[PDB]
A paper describes a structure:
Psychrophilic β-d-galactosidase from Arthrobacter sp. 32cB is an interesting candidate for industrial use, as it can hydrolyze lactose at rate comparable to mesophilic βDG from Kluyveromyces lactis. Furthermore, it exhibits additional transglycosylation activity, it catalyzes synthesis of GOS and HOS, for example: lactulose and alkyl glycosides. The functional dimer of ArthβDG has two independent active sites.
The question of the effect of point mutation of the other catalytic residue, E517, has not been answered before. As expected of the mutation of the catalytic residue, E517 into glutamine caused loss of function of the enzyme. In the case of 50 mM sodium phosphate pH 6.0, it attained 49 °C, which means that it was higher by 4.5 °C compared to wild-type protein. The structures of ArthβDG mutants: ArthβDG_D207A and ArthβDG_E517Q, were solved proving that the point mutations within the active site of ArthβDG have no destabilizing effect on protein’s structure. The inactive mutant E517Q was designed specially to enable binding of transglycosylation product—lactulose, in the active site of enzyme and thus elucidating the mode of its binding.
Numbering used by the authors:
A (entry chain A), B (entry chain A): 22 to 1010
The structure:
């Protein structure tokens, strides 16, 4: 019979296993003096729902365009109202049947008219730095070719096709193609021509490609320099000039520069250079550095380095995969400002302009090829393109374009084959190709744990325990003795760790101590730098971030795309403030007697001469003493004890007992740097003189009794419930025990440890911890002092359908001014439910007050939140914030905002002030309840109800990283137990 | 110190382990000529939230009532806006810490003024037939006592307290008490004075209690009669008269009536009798029957009986636990009309008036004590009141009041100790007490499988397989040899089986065949008779039923209270129509040659003389022949072959081949009965002459091709998709394969069989069956006949992120009038997901039509729905219903309304008619999509969208009873497989 379906030819091309056709050889991205014209700007665009209905109406000519409208290019076109973004993590959004594509496949036709002056003849090309996922390119109706590899560059010769004057460039882009099966990164699906489009003249006697080789001999101090230059794939005559080093040499010859200052992330020394032929000159920035593996350590310039890293996706909350240059520069500065020294380009090459900025600002870069096949894992990796010989040419092409583009940049210290792509013959082919092309950079790939085709051993989210075993070289052996010996000689990197989703990440300090202890450990890269929030404006014009499912997706992964150290607009999350402290490159340990501090220089290359060392003593009234102390430069990996002026110690000795005072020593930048202004804080340490325990008020005030109320000084109690209804005139609507919090993203994750396959959030719901009930057992007034009395209220807390509970006793006392509150908690019954021991989130009290709080002040840790396994960046001091600024604007609202280690607190309720003191407690204050917080999926769902929710916790659980990787470490868990704690309360005007 | 809490005395009483205080001895409910006054009517009512704030303001006197309002009594007070109903199944709504009660405990103060004439002096009492859960009673300010046992009667002597003329009765009712721990039935929590309140004069020389003993000697035909009569607990002189039997005897003497007609559910013969003393006469209805266990069979009057039973809760959708008498009478008639002969009073004694109606209409009754402690199971039965000696007196009191009230009623054939109360010493004490008081009725209790203290072996939801083993006496042995021998000599009853929640129950026929095969099997009681829906009126005034969670409950069990054979207003569900057929008491097997039918009388006592046997032959045009055939009475458990008139067989022989005709033989009531009018259908059987296969149209019409459309006779196809866009001018918006349906309540239940602990609904979601995607592979026109052509469209169906699929090929053909459609389905890949084989709900097609359907007609099974393991009550015939009447109004919308076994169908779309024919298919038609159906939680969420959703299924899965008990039996499951089926389509005006 006769074939009748439509669009079969277009679909066959989209199903191609091969790389793009018609492109020039892959090469470096080079700054050249050749004439160039950027075609970025306002293009014309038409969208069709699939190949079979994509018109074949000659639109490529620009004449009588039917159905086109203006669209910026570069762009991710769903960010501009054409379709919508869609988020999946691992799962494909289409049926898995490679190489076939779904019928619903957005086809975007792009068209731009431009003018080519005489400087673009006789030879020129068109460059495309990124098209997701399949491009077909026509110029003046003539097909140039196709693009595969969404984040890779393609160039097409236009000689004999480009015309003098007006030209018409047409590009048909398909969202889905066979290449989608190898681009399954955990991120938004966003088609478009999302990077630069450039016309570049190719003058005769020019330079097509350049390969910089700039090594460093750390013994002699020599630089080893060879700059290759080619045209049409052939080495050519060219002259290399490096003026700062008094150098003129031929391209292609290796020389020995007697002395060079070596490049590192800490000291990113770059030498300006130019390589030029008769027709073209290329400008280079040369950093001399050598990379080697020896004694199972990753070494640069002869030294083991510590990677303080993040995984960087490219995302912008309004432009999608288009990241404006100013945002790139700003976020790299922000990384440096938080002590980061390393970046993994998860999981594809970045915009080409990123490389020079990393060279300049100083980051160790893991440059990763555009390859991920994670969605094949759930079928046992059946049909995985990574092990399918039909995909070999396509995957080698991806690696070749990755390597060729960025090979000249000192910041790149490892090539990565891809991410979560299983094991297979094509990964081996990619590795062999890279090792042969560029032996100067070790190869990284986590997906094959046997590490057969790599030079470093990489894992993601390995526990602190397994990392310690690896650090000692005693992890279990591979079955193959030869492969085991190879891997045991490799250094070890965590390419992803301490998953930073929501409240968290907990457990960072335990990893860092191992990094410092064991040379084989290279460090780690946090997952991830940024949340992929997409800005949404609601009915009222109130902006907030959207995540998976908020754009009508049929299958999605929710807020797992919002898992970053900064939000999509680069505002730090608390996790980044903690991370900065965890990875600080200097350690400052202040002596308890305030005579001095131990200073350890944790850097690998630089001394301490860039830093100014400042001290300040702060007390309740303010600063009492402070200044700068001169420190002879301390070498990398060396230590010294720095004396503080005698006045500081003398001040500590004269302090009256119980008066709190904090000595803080900081290392700040002595001068402006390329990434921060002078005075920027890099490291700090403290010694605290703690306030004395608040003496409980003498119980000299008696209990006065009325039919329905009891009064004890400034406290009024309901006689029916035994609970206070007001304290100093502040209405108390509720007081009770808490054991639960609104689950974090981590609490919604499964702990793949133990026989319990429920997330902690589910364990808590099953146990009833979110719906506690209180029974009153009795109320008694007991003799106090000089006619005074204490009031003891006995209660039992439990939950419907449960037999376990806790006996909670409140003992109240007052001298008329201060109120004393002792709370005693005693376990009743066995706290087991559905066969497993119940764990608590906290041991604390919730005060619900009938008035709003405008201001929260405290002495403790701050300014930001802290939980048992977080809060490293929260330092001791006196803090005060408006109520709203106590919250944390996580995209999915969740437990957050607790200030652990508080010794005193003050809430301003309009005109009066409520003061809380006692042994250390955690402090949280909110204008809405925990049930409202738990129910809210986006921040607009949070609405104040005119009350104050005050949380005073005697104990808290950690937050961990159970959303992906380890849960809460054993020492931070909270099993049911007896407890007792004392508070004082005071209300003033 | 000094005690200061409030209300401690009230709470201490509520925590009492003891029975109520102050009541007269428990006795029978008796029809007496003693003067009586019902105090039912409009009372005054005040509600307090708990004991500690319940006023002690002297309200018991009726003077200056502060805060009282009118309330009907009897009532469940949350049904009248005081609080709200709350539904839990097993879980308690309060902390489990017996005997303690929560602080939130509705306290209802009831008050009524009444007048007592001289006939109520000097002696009278007040009777309360039910108070949930704790009552305290005052008369004229004087405390009478308290009530415990919510569904049990209490009487208080008011001699010397009742006054001539005006009196004031005050009752304080607490919702929760220690007794709540032993009243954990799966039902709504509903406090109130919910049964009659009566003043009764007690004249001197009267009769307090009566115990009827009326046995039957099945050998001699004698009745064995002894009527005991007592006053103040002492046997008294009284005369018993039974006029119909020519009897006058003294109370307390056993006599032998020479001949009596025995009582059974089938023939509920009752003799009017009176026992009288000088001061009082009591009217009785005496049914002579004897109960015995012999040869491991439960026998009445010397015959093993088959229980065709339901579990009857007391519920009314607007009045709660108050069931108006007219509703009781109507629903018992409805039970008889659906062949039911047995009732279990789950799980408490019914209203006292129920007993006489069961005597009269004829049901075997399992009368169950008010005891259930199910909520202790989840803590390993720790603290279970059933094994706590401190609860012995309270639990024996419950059993004593249960037995004493109803002991005179022939319909009661077993006493049940309670339900789901574990095992324990107090259950044994209850059994010992009952066996001693009334040896004439065997004891039932399912909670102790060892059956130590019972006379029958009872289970709930035992599988058909285990029931077959029990029926053969080869179930596994108990560890105790003595207890094993006892239990193996017991008959076996399913006190609850074939859970009737939502679409279902499936698997009824397999149980019934075992009941018929094995004498040891007594039968079973369906769970349950009625859905406990509560009527709710929404914003627009649209009524619907609410279930758990719809009334603000903190903990609840959702729609598990809507699990009945009839809805709360007693409208039959399809399950009741199927059940009636399953348990029909006669079997009618029509010969294939239409010469006669085999008639088996499945009754235990009655012959067939109450029935008229009618036949009718029906064809497309209408009835062709019919009449009545005289049948000599067939004895119980006997069989005969009844000849039909020769004209019927002659008609079958003359039928042209392929013409459909149905011979139906019915057994209807020959005369009015007490429960249905003459002509009521009891049993039926059929023989069908099936229509010949529709010959496919000759493919003489060719495919005409256009740029974007293909036309083949009356079918227009999209050339882009290959699917029809119209058939005979009827718009087709979508056509595709189906494998999924909107989960039933059963599909949301876990199959505790196999290693997969996901409900089927979850298995389907995980597998993507609800989100199928279709890829087009090709379209071809092939040579047909005489220039005609067929059109074959090749597709593959799968789901996002899955590698398995099905190849689906559509072959279209037409002669211009009729359209032929062949569908071929071929498995592609292994249909396994998350480690388990995927199961399908169906193999079918969904047509989405762009116009509404007003009427659906078909030849097949009807009128109601049928699935592979249901539809017994759906008979063969021609049916036609408005679209809305094809649906089933389940409270939670779910898959329903399929008509299996359809051979032809006709949809009326405005003016035109769409006809479907072919080999048997299942037919479903809806005005909304499956996704709308699945998302809808209540019926108002269903909204028509102006389309027609037509489902034609080649195969369906069964529905089972997985919500509670067995899932779908193996033979009704649907594993992925290849399939092929043919349809013809025709559109007319
Ligand atoms: Na991934
Ligand atoms: Na993520
Ligand atoms: Na939330
Ligand atoms: Na139960
Ligand atoms: Na139920
Ligand atoms: Na539904």
């Amino acid at each position: 019979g006769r074939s009748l379906e439509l669009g079969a030819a277009d679909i066959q091309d989209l199903e191609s296993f091969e790389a793009g056709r018609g492109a020039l050889p892959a090469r470096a991205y080079l700054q050249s003096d050749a004439p160039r014209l950027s075609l970025n700007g306002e293009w014309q665009f038409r969208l069709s729902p699939g190949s079979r209905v994509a018109p074949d109406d000659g639109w490529q000519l620009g004449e009588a365009l039917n159905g086109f409208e203006s669209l910026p290019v570069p762009s991710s076109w769903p960010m501009h109202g054409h379709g919508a973004p869609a988020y999946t993590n691992v799962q494909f959004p289409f049926a898995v049947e490679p190489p076939h594509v779904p019928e619903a496949n957005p086809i975007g036709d792009h068209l731009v008219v431009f003018e080519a002056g005489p400087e673009f003849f006789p030879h020129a090309l068109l460059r495309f730095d990124g098209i997701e996922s399949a491009g077909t390119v026509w110029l003046n109706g003539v097909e140039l070719g196709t693009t595969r590899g969404s984040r890779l560059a393609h160039e097409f010769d236009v000689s004999g096709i480009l015309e003098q004057g007006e030209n018409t460039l047409a590009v048909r882009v398909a969202q889905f193609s066979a290449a989608s099966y190898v681009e399954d990164q955990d991120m938004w699906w966003l088609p478009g021509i999302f990077r630069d489009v450039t016309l570049q003249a190719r003058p005769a006697a020019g330079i097509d490609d350049v390969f910089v080789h700039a090594g460093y001999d750390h013994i002699t101090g020599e630089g080893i320099l060879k700059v290759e230059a080619s045209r049409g794939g052939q080495a050519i005559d060219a002259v290399v000039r490096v003026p700062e080093l008094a150098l003129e040499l031929a391209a292609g010859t290796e020389v020995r520069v007697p002395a060079v200052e070596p490049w590192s992330a800490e000291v990113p020394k770059l030498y300006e250079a130019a390589v030029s032929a008769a027709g073209e000159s290329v400008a280079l920035q040369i950093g001399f550095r050598s990379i080697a593996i020896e004694d199972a350590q990753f070494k640069v310039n002869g030294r083991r380095i510590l990677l303080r890293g993040v995984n960087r996706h490219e995302h912008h909350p309004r432009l999608g995969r288009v990241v404006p240059r100013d945002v790139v520069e700003a976020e790299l500065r922000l990384m440096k400002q938080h002590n980061i020294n390393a970046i993994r380009t998860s999981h594809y090459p970045p915009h080409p302009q990123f490389l020079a900025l990393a060279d300049q600002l100083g980051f160790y870069v893991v440059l990763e090829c555009d390859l991920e096949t994670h969605g094949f894992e759930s079928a046992g990796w059946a049909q995985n393109p990574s092990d399918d010989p039909q995909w070999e040419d396509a995957l080698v092409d991806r690696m070749r374009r990755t390597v060729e583009r960025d090979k000249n940049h000192a910041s790149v210290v490892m090539w990565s084959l891809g991410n979560e792509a299983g094991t297979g013959r094509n990964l081996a082919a990619m590795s062999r190709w890279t090792k042969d092309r560029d032996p100067s950079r070790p190869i990284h790939y986590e997906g094959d744990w046997s590490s057969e085709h790599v030079d470093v051993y990489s894992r993601m989210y390995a526990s602190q325990a397994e990392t310690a075993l690896i650090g000692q070289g005693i992890e279990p052996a591979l079955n193959d003795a030869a492969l085991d010996a190879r891997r045991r000689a490799m250094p070890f990197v965590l390419c992803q760790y301490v998953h930073a989703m929501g409240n968290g990440p907990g457990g960072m300090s335990e990893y860092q101590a191992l990094f410092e202890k064991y040379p084989r450990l290279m460090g780690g890269f946090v997952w991830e730098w940024l949340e992929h929030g997409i800005t949404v404006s609601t009915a009222d014009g109130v902006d907030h971030y959207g995540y998976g499912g908020d754009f009508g997706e049929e299958v999605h992964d929710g807020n797992f795309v919002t898992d970053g150290l900064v939000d999509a607009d680069r505002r730090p999350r608390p996790g980044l403030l903690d991370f900065k402290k965890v990875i600080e490159p200097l350690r400052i340990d202040v002596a308890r007697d305030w005579t001095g501090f131990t200073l350890r220089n944790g850097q690998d290359f630089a001394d301490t001469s860039a830093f100014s060392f400042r001290y300040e003593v702060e007390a309740d009234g303010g600063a009492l003493d402070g200044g700068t102390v001169d420190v002879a430069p301390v070498a990398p990996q060396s230590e010294t004890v720095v004396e503080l002026p005698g006045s500081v110690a003398a001040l500590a000795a004269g302090l009256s007992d119980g008066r709190p005072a904090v000595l803080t020593v900081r290392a700040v930048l002595g001068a402006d740097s390329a990434w921060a202004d002078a005075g920027h804080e890099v490291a700090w340490g403290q010694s605290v003189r703690e306030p004395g325990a608040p003496v409980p008020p003498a119980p000299v005030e008696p209990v006065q009794v009325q039919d329905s109320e009891l009064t004890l000084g400034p406290v009024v109690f309901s006689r029916a419930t035994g609970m206070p209804t007001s304290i100093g005139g502040v209405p108390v609507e509720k007081l009770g025990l808490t054991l639960w919090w609104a689950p974090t993203d981590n609490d919604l994750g499964r702990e793949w440890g133990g026989a319990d396959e429920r997330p902690l959030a589910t364990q808590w719901k099953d146990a009833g911890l979110n719906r506690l009930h209180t029974r009153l057992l009795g109320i008694s007034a007991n003799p106090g002092q000089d006619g005074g009395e204490t009031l003891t209220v006995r209660t039992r807390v439990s939950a419907a359908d449960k037999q376990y509970g806790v006996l909670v006793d409140y003992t109240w006392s007052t001298d008329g001014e201060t109120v004393g509150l002792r709370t005693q908690v005693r376990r009743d019954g066995t706290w087991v439910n559905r066969g497993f021991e119940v764990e608590w989130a906290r041991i604390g009290l919730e005060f619900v007050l009938g008035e709003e709080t405008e201001l929260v002040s405290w002495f403790g840790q701050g300014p930001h939140q802290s939980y048992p396994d977080t809060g490293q960046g929260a330092r001791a001091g006196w803090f005060s914030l408006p109520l709203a600024k106590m919250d944390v604007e996580y995209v999915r609202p969740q437990e957050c905002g607790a200030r652990s280690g508080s010794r005193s607190a003050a809430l301003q309720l309009g005109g009066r002030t409520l003061e809380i003191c006692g042994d250390p407690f955690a402090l949280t204050v909110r204008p809405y309840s925990q049930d409202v917080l738990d129910a809210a999926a986006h921040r607009p769902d949070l609405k104040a109800d005119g009350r104050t929710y005050l949380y005073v916790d005697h104990a808290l659980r950690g937050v961990g990283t159970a959303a992906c990787g380890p849960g809460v470490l054993e020492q931070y868990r909270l099993k049911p137990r007896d407890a007792d704690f004392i508070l004082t309360l005071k209300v003033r005007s």
